[PDB]
């Protein structure tokens, strides 16, 4: 939960899950940026955020 993530300020589980490159799922409200370039599609830039 992103709500809990912001509320409690903890980052332990998420950091360890992401560092070891393991599947994760986040549920919560997020603004989106629309990119419609196939250059961005081929050159992976959807995970560097």
């Amino acid at each position: 939960n992103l709500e809990e993530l912001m509320r409690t300020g903890s980052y332990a589980q998420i950091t360890n899950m992401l560092l070891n490159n393991q599947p994760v799922a986040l549920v919560g409200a997020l603004p989106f940026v629309t990119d419609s370039s196939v250059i961005s599609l081929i050159a992976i830039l959807d995970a560097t955020v």
Binding site: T8, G9, S10, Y11
Partner: protein, 49 residues
């Protein structure tokens, strides 16, 4: 080149140093444990030893 008294003094000062290595675990357990166990505060290690 020194007299035995001076050399004994200096060697005793050298071998009885008061300094100890500083690890991440040591600096983490030096912080009081009750505050570490809390959830209101978050302790993050950022500086590189």
């Amino acid at each position: 080149i020194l007299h035995p008294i001076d050399y004994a003094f200096n060697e005793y000062f050298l071998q009885h140093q008061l300094v100890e290595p500083l690890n991440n675990d040591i600096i983490f357990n030096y912080i009081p444990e009750r505050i570490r166990n809390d959830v209101n505060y978050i302790l993050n290690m950022d500086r590189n030893l």
